[PDB]
Amino acid sequence: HMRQTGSFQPFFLRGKVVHSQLGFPTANIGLDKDVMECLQPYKNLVVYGWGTVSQVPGKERESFGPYPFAASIGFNTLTVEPYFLHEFGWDFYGAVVKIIVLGEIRSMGSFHSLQALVDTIKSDVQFTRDMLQKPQLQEFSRHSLFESPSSTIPYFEDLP
């Protein structure tokens, strides 16, 4: 795992959820040219923080979270691929996702064996959980940006 240093700038990101035989997740946050530029300093990384899911088609009134999450930021075009540490039991394509990214786990890197990938995701999941239990970072679950209204999608913002 990467050292948790104050070179990492935390931020906020709001956007809609959009679209190997194993069936990995291919859910992304819809970006635009400006927000892709903001994310450039975070490319080639797996990151973690708190997120929420809202305005889910069919369940449009409800709101889910805040939940722990990890996410990959890289090219595919800068892509953001979030992995909520939560079992919804369904997909939420077209739902608005809001995330606060609080730190970095590692570079996206590469695997040879399949057991290597799984042992690394398990390590990412537990790390993200151990970090978010910290009193300082736990407080960001209750952050006001989640409750902020704004019709601007996507939207990016730095945290002090």
Side-chain angles (χ1 to χ4, degrees), residues 1-2 4-59 62-74 78-160:
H1 301 114
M2 288 173 161
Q4 299 308 299
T5 345
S7 67
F8 187 90
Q9 168 64 62
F11 66 86
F12 173 78
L13 184 51
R14 177 178 57 247
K16 295 211 189 195
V17 181
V18 301
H19 295 80
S20 187
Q21 305 289 322
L22 281 156
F24 288 105
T26 61
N28 311 282
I29 302 183
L31 311 179
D32 61 13
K33 192 182 284 78
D34 174 279
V35 173
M36 280 186 50
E37 192 184 31
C38 285
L39 295 166
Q40 287 299 127
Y42 307 100
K43 73 192 187 180
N44 202 222
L45 302 175
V46 179
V47 299
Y48 66 91
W50 295 102
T52 66
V53 172
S54 293
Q55 293 180 317
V56 180
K59 313 155 175 286
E62 213 149 43
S63 189
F64 304 87
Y67 303 119
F69 85 89
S72 302
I73 295 87
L78 198 288
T79 305
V80 172
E81 194 180 60
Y83 325 114
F84 276 99
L85 285 43
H86 177 72
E87 328 94 71
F88 294 91
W90 33 256
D91 282 311
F92 41 94
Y93 291 103
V96 181
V97 58
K98 300 173 199 176
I99 58 165
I100 295 182
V101 170
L102 293 164
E104 62 196 350
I105 303 186
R106 59 195 180 81
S107 62
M108 284 176 45
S110 64
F111 308 90
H112 304 292
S113 55
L114 175 58
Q115 223 152 354
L117 176 41
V118 171
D119 286 339
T120 298
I121 304 324
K122 271 155 60 202
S123 297
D124 296 338
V125 174
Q126 220 83 295
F127 178 68
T128 296
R129 287 191 159 164
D130 289 351
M131 293 304 306
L132 292 171
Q133 292 283 47
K134 296 165 94 174
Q136 197 197 50
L137 272 39
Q138 185 95 129
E139 197 80 310
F140 284 91
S141 66
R142 308 146 59 258
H143 204 280
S144 43
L145 272 282
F146 289 125
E147 295 167 9
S148 183
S150 168
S151 57
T152 300
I153 32 165
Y155 182 77
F156 172 100
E157 173 167 347
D158 276 320
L159 272 44

